[PDB]
């Protein structure tokens, strides 16, 4: 019944102080720490996420976890900060500077024995847990390289709980780090088999929503990863909210996973549109049914229709009848079934739940499962090999002890991911 | 002269608690169980308390919460809610074996002490999915152990038929091809409705166009009711449950058995006109009425069953099913003879306050095994299939320790079936 | 027509505490002893107070000084307060021998002064714990004494029974082992209970999951209760203690029946539910009430009393006991034939303001001697074993001049009781 | 029904003086000497620590001994120096300087005899006496030296009276004196076989404490021996004040030690916190129960899980059920069996008073005879050893006439105790 959460990153980092803040938002939890809400339900499955401490006091059950001082405070300096205990920062000194070498295989390492320890301290205050979740970039280096470190323990502690992570999944045209492929191509060949599910944030395709159809100037980061916080949030609730389907995480992880390697998922979200057109939108299941389908509404800078869907999750907040939406799912097999694999009948499965997100009526979270999620390991394949040959950064790396003959595995590993798509891509 | 219900999974409790509801509705009962006035189903306090005698099981703690802090949590013995906190996640290979199967004994220790209570246990039934983990994983788990130790009572199951168009379990084949092969040889009879067929009711007899499942569950309740209220109260011909059994199971597999109900009228559309008992029961052999998606003119009836509400009298009755023998298209199969149960109670029609249904003055229940269901199967048969050729989502129940073969043998179990209605298509 | 109880250790004390304040309520006894209404425990004097006949020893002055600053200190006499300064330890050597066997003899003689208080000496019964210095050390040093006096009045022994999951007490063993070799020979009757075994019945039948000694307490109250203030008032079978002991003491052994007490239930589980008298006695032989942690299937029962409270009647029992004696699992030693004694009190069940226990209409209180008692001696025979093995902790008899020889005698003789009971197990 | 206690050496004379402090603290005395509570328990078992003077003032049955009037005008000047009588302040005039042959062997011996003295005054004014404690350093001169001196006499002349000593054991960091572990090992020649228990304190481990878990930078010694008076008053108090389970001394020495020579304790203490976190702490059992077995919430520089558990109290003040800390020992005990010792079935030991600490709800005292014990020992008699080689400082001590193979026979008894334990570890 429980989860734990871990950050990490800089990324990590400032995903989850939004993440966070929703979840106190949903249950009227004040950036202090107390609880002034005013719904049964607020605190009647708040556990899944807090602590209640001495006092009344909710304790958000998560390790925020960074190599420098410096933006760990900067999260402890906003509102919900404050909520943190300090015993949730675990950090060091030293950056790791993006380089996964120096935080999965050397000096990260050092630090995670005591985030683990701090885990442990975490597991045993949960009554029981469901799972664990993980916030981090792919192409970072306390990201992904500690993180991912940090993952394989957790989940040789624990094989029988849910071990999801979500990562920034390094977009065709902003990568940072000059070896980011390095460093994703490294954590797939990590985590893929040391998790239950990941999945594809791409902030290019974030960034096109927001103009696209929310006709935004502004954003930041922080207006971005409030669009990644609602489909983090919007999964969980209905797991702790009364609905009406069937309102189990591992029960979504089943339904999502047809072979054990490949997992991993295009997160879209309905509705999501300006303020402009409120006052022209109707708001019915097909309406939102519509928002989930089209591939510009998706968060992954994937197209759905150009793979083929293993599978498709549907998650309704909010009252709606059985009957529309049973049948307004249907249509959308029916209509995109030339996208459906073959070999699942009825590849679209709903979740509903009865509570709508605070300030809506309705909304629905798409998770997908596509073979067009392949495209993104071949452009990172690729571009890891042109880099591999020139053992670009790679000093840094294998200064660090980093040997190439686990790189090539991890291609290889890569390109298994791409192989076996296709292999189910028929 | 008892009877005890099961609740298990969200469909099976949200069903019960409509169902609930409704005997609540039929005698006057309050919230706190304090009755003013049905002791088959009740079990009486000092205080003139009556508690229902069921239990409510579920693995996540939610749904039954709901019962918990609903007005409802007065009737219910704290003992009767059970619950666990995780669940099936859909799947058999938990519902059944790893999860479910640390609780059953519990609730098993909680149904004997009801069987303890009950001075004369007729028997049971368990409401239920046929493709949720709990819903029908534990469901079948519970199975294995009551008809051991109440062999001899009535087991009827009542659960929800997988709608063919809409499902939001996509190993619900799995899952249920996983019951049929445990309930099969289990249960003593199995009924089942689709919610994608009541919505069609809904819209066309109600006029309603935007069914819930708490409206869907109401009607659900009125056709229960008339087979557990009304059949415990007064009439001409009172049937029993076990009568039930008696006379609408045929053969030592499963039946089936689908239900129609007529009347299922708006409140509009009650007005401006007559029903009488012969044209309620017309409307009962109409397609269009039919609570599963499934043509009744494609199969051949093996059984049907008929049970009366208010205002029947057995003179109009019989004329009725004159012509429902000889005017209809129905087709039998050659080994029945055409005796239908007919049960007739005094007893009216009764309806939810503030729900669609039009108050009636009498009404019609049809319960009917016909031989289209072999192609209920062959949608399982074919859905099975292609998630098993592929093998997608087997390592969901394969790591809770399922056998592949064992998915074969049950899909095998189900072609058996298939071929016995086949079988019994076959006149002789 | 009188009795003595006897509170040694804190245990004793703390227990008695309750037992008195229940003996209070029973008949609304202030706590200055003014009773405006049992004199079988009580002495009066010409105030109208009344002395409740019992002795309280605490060889640490603390429990006595709790109940001498309590509310009831009014109402026990300041000489059958009795405190020493220093302890036991935790230990046979000192609380038997070296520390307890200086006070003594002032106990003895303010008992002794009670004994001839006593007109009609029934008999008496000591409270204490197997475990603790005090509890069980100078228990048994005073069975010694009380064996000779009053060789043939009434000797029954309740102790808390060490649980086998937890203990503060690391020479607890060794205690036990001690005293089972004196007490045995001396006693003619030890009842016992666990802590832990109560918690479960707390947590399932209370629903409490807060247990604390004072509401542990309240539980033990009632079933002494039943069998000390309701044994003396009317019913229809007035039961006395040496009828007690007469109808529960089958061999010259020892003798250990344990207690099982139904009802044991929260007030809101005592809404919605009606129980007869069979239903409380069928409550009573689910190992979920039994109060020690031993299970009642795994051995043979030898011994079986049921004493009643308020509305009961034989009838109704004579039914109940037909079914216990057909229907259950309930082995039964050859030896005996089915003969419980039955104790029917038309006395009602009385219920402590504020309290966990629901108001009862009637109560059934659960006496029995089964052949798994063995395997509570089998715990202890390795805990002993383990620790002798080592020499843990042996220092802390030895320097009180206890031997080692002793010791692995006091084994051997458990060890011969529970060959003894393996003989009974075997039938004849 | 009661105690003597006794204070000697630098460290001896401050640590009481907190000590006392608190003990006031616990009945409402005022540093004046009167009693000002307001408990009918503050004044009903006050008996075992203070005699009450005519006019209702309080006098501490203790001793201060030292070798300098300076130290003990120190302790004299604060508030609770007043409450001590004149007569309880023996000492001397010049020094010991650290030097065990000037405190036991020769000078110092000659203030023992003033001492003694004042002891026996002291005896007879007890009913009666449960026994005497001593507070101390193993490497000091006054602290050990004379200390152990007069240890040895008091036993002498009360056989039957609980001898206990807590002592402040040579951290591995820091040693003053160049001879400290000299001092210490001649300790252990003396004292083992002189007490009936002793209590191991790590300065080091106390420092950690202080920061690691109560995030605190500006301790002083006064802050540290705050924490060391809270277990010593712990367990007194209960004896003191009525509560559950069995509040005796004695019963307690007879639960910890298995066998003659192996009486070396490690304390520790529980709920114990900074500030920041009880906003986000529970109080309940199993949070006591976390606090007490994790080894760094001991005082002692020791890893009981590196040694096997031999005895284990835990000592429990304020209202808890039974049931809970019954269930929640049994977990320790079985989830950490491979840590204890497989001789003594059901080797954690309860204790339960239902008086809290003044200001907390719950607490405590985790009291533990592990073999990890004997690593200390193995410390200090090798560098011994080293010394003893090179007989540094040995010219003042065989100057005072201490002889070398008193010396080489104290070194085979810490050598006996490590055998000893590996004897019991198995
Ligand atoms: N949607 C978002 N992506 C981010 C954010 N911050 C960084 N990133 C992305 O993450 C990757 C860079 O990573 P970080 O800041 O998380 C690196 P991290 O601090 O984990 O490790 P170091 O190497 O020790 O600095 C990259 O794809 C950035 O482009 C953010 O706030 N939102
Ligand atoms: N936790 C504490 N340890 C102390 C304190 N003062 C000293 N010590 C420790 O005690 C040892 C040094 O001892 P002292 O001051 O007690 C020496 P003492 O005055 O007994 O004798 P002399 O040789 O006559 O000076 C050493 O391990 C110091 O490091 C204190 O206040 N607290
Ligand atoms: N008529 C009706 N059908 C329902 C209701 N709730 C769910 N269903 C149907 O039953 C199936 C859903 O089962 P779930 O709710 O997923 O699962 P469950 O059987 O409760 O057990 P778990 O999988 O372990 O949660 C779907 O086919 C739904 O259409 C309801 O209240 N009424
Ligand atoms: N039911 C019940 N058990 C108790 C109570 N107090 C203590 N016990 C149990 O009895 C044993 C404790 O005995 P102690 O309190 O240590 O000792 P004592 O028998 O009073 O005598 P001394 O050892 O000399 O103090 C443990 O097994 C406790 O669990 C109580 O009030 N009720
Ligand atoms: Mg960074
Ligand atoms: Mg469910
Ligand atoms: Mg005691
Ligand atoms: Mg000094």
Request: charged share 20%; proline share 5%.
């Amino acid at each position: 019944r429980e989860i734990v959460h871990i950050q990490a990153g800089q990324c990590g980092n400032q995903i989850g102080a939004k993440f966070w803040e929703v979840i106190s938002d949903e249950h009227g939890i004040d950036p202090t720490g107390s609880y002034h809400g005013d719904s049964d339900l607020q605190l009647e499955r708040i556990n899944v996420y807090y602590n209640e401490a001495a006092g009344n006091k909710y304790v958000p059950r998560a390790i925020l976890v960074d190599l420098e001082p410096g933006t760990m405070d900067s999260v402890r300096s906003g509102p919900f900060g404050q909520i943190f205990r300090p015993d949730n920062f675990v950090f060091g000194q030293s950056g790791a500077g993006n380089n996964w070498a120096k935080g999965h295989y050397t000096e990260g390492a050092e630090l995670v024995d005591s985030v683990l320890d701090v885990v442990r301290k975490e597991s045993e205050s949960c009554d029981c847990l469901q799972g664990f979740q993980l916030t981090h970039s792919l192409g970072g280096g306390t990201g992904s390289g500690m993180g991912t470190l940090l993952i394989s323990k957790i989940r040789e502690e624990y094989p029988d709980r849910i071990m999801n992570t979500f990562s920034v999944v390094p977009s065709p045209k902003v990568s940072d780090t000059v070896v980011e492929p390095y460093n994703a191509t490294l954590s797939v060949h990590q985590l893929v088999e040391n998790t239950d599910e990941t999945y594809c944030i791409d902030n290019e395709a974030l960034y096109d929503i927001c103009f696209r159809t929310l006709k935004l100037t502004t954003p930041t980061y922080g207006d971005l990863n409030h669009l990644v916080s609602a489909t983090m949030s919007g999964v969980t609730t209905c797991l702790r909210f009364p609905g009406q389907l069937n309102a189990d995480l591992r029960k979504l992880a089943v339904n999502m996973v047809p072979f054990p390697r490949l997992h991993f998922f295009m997160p879209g979200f309905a509705p999501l549109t300006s303020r402009g057109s409120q006052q022209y939108r109707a708001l019915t299941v097909p309406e939102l049914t519509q928002q989930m389908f089209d591939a510009k509404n998706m968060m992954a800078a994937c197209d759905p229709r150009h793979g083929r869907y293993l599978t498709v999750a549907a998650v309704f907040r909010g009252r709606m009848s059985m009957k529309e939406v049973d049948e307004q799912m249907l249509n959308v097999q029916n209509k995109n079934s030339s996208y459906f694999v073959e070999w699942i009948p009825n590849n679209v499965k709903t979740a509903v739940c009865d509570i709508p997100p605070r300030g809506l009526k309705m909304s629905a979270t798409f998770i997908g499962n596509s073979t067009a999620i392949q495209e993104l390991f071949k452009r990172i394949s690729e571009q890891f090999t042109a880099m591999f040959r020139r053992k670009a950064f790679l000093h840094w790396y294998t200064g660090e002890g980093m040997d190439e003959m686990e790189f090539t595995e991890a291609e290889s590993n890569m390109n298994d991911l791409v192989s076996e798509y296709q292999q189910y891509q028929d | 002269r008892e009877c005890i219900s099961i609740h298990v999974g969200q469909a099976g409790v949200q069903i019960g608690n409509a169902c609930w509801e409704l005997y609540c509705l039929e005698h006057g009962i309050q919230p706190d169980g304090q009755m003013p006035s049905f002791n088959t189903f009740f079990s009486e306090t000092g205080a003139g308390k009556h508690v229902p005698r069921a239990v409510f099981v579920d693995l996540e703690p939610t749904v039954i919460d709901e019962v918990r802090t609903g007005t409802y949590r007065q009737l219910f013995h704290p003992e009767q809610l059970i619950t666990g906190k995780e669940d099936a996640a859909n799947n058999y290979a938990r519902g059944h074996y790893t999860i479910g199967k640390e609780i059953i004994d519990l609730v098993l220790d909680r149904i004997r002490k009801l069987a303890d209570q009950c001075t004369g246990l007729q028997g049971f039934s368990v409401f239920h999915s046929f493709g949720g983990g709990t819903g029908s994983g534990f469901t079948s788990l519970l199975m294995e152990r009551l008809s051991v130790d109440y062999g001899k009572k009535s087991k009827l199951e009542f659960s929800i038929y997988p709608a063919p168009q809409v499902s939001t379990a996509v190993v619900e084949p799995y899952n249920s091809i996983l019951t049929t092969h445990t309930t099969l040889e289990h249960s003593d009879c199995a009924f089942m409705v689709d919610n994608e067929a009541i919505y069609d009711i809904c819209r066309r007899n109600l006029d309603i166009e935007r069914p819930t499942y708490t409206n869907l569950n109401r009607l659900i309740g009125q056709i229960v009711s008339s087979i557990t209220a009304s059949l415990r109260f007064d009439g001409a011909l009172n049937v029993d449950l076990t009568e039930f059994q008696t006379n609408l199971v045929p053969y030592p597999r499963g039946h089936f058995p689908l239900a129609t109900y007529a009347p299922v009228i708006s409140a509009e559309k009650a007005y401006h006109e007559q029903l009488s008992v012969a044209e309620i029961t017309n409307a009962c052999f109409e397609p269009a009425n039919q609570m599963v998606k499934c043509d009744p003119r494609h199969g051949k009836y093996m059984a049907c069953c008929l049970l009366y509400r208010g205002d029947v009298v057995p003179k109009d009755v019989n004329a009725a099913i004159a012509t429902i023998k000889t005017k209809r298209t129905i087709q039998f199969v050659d080994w029945c003879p055409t005796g239908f149960k007919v049960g007739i109670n005094y007893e009216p029609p009764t309806v939810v306050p503030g729900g669609d249904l039009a108050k009636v003055q009498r009404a019609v229940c049809m319960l009917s095994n016909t031989t289209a269901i072999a192609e209920a199967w062959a949608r399982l048969d074919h859905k099975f299939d292609l998630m098993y050729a592929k093998r997608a989502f087997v390592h969901w129940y394969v790591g809770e320790g399922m056998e592949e073969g064992e998915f074969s043998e049950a899909r095998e179990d189900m072609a058996a079936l298939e071929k016995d209605y086949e079988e019994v298509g076959v006149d002789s």
